[PDB]
């Protein structure tokens, strides 16, 4: 509908791809190569799903910062026969808030879901389903079960993906450039 929806489109339509797990099915960012954002909570293993298609999973990692602490960010190395697109220059480079943020859905069950979310906290820690969490970015949008992994952009970056809500807020981990400097 205007700028922003604008650059969250143009991200969902080169650099996501539909993740499904045991845990269920996720919005998942490209980011670079063959390298991918997912939540740790959907407990990635040797094999995924994406787009349908059983995938090897050549490397994986969750990301916990510099006192063991759960950030909510596993990044996977996927055997696949295609690189996405680099969108590593669109990563803030700091911990920040922002205005008029958007958080993007595609899924079987939410394809095309565009969110506008409106100012986002840097909220910092927040117990995520029991689990001390940091860099956590927070909205006041009630976002449901099947909005996990989920983009959420201002115009001109990707911030985060969505990690989880309390019914009244919507929480994200921090997407940060130094997370996948190669
Ligand atoms: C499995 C995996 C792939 C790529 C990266 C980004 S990097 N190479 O800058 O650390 C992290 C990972 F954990």
Redesign the pocket.
């Known amino acids: 509908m205007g700028p922003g929806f604008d650059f969250a489109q143009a991200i969902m339509k080169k650099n996501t791809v539909i993740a499904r797990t045991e845990k269920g099915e996720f919005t998942m960012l490209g980011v670079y190569d063959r390298?991918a954002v997912i939540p740790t909570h959907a407990s990635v293993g040797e094999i995924i799903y994406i787009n349908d298609v059983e995938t090897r999973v050549l490397?994986?990692?969750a990301l916990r910062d510099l006192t063991d602490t759960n950030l909510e960010i596993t990044?996977?190395?996927l055997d696949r026969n295609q690189k996405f697109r680099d969108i590593r220059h669109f990563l803030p480079r700091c911990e920040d808030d922002y205005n008029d943020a958007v958080l993007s859905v595609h899924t079987s069950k939410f394809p095309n879901m565009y969110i506008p979310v409106g100012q986002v906290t840097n909220y910092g820690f927040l117990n995520l389903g029991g689990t001390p969490t940091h860099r956590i970015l927070m909205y006041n949008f009630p976002t449901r079960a099947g909005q996990c992994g989920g983009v959420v952009t201002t115009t001109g970056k990707v911030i985060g993906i969505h990690v989880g809500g309390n019914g009244a807020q919507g929480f994200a981990a921090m997407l940060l450039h130094s997370?996948?400097?190669?």
Do not use: E, L, R, S
Not at 179 to 182: A, I, L, M, R, W
């Open positions: 390298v490397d994986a990692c990044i996977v190395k997370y996948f400097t190669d």
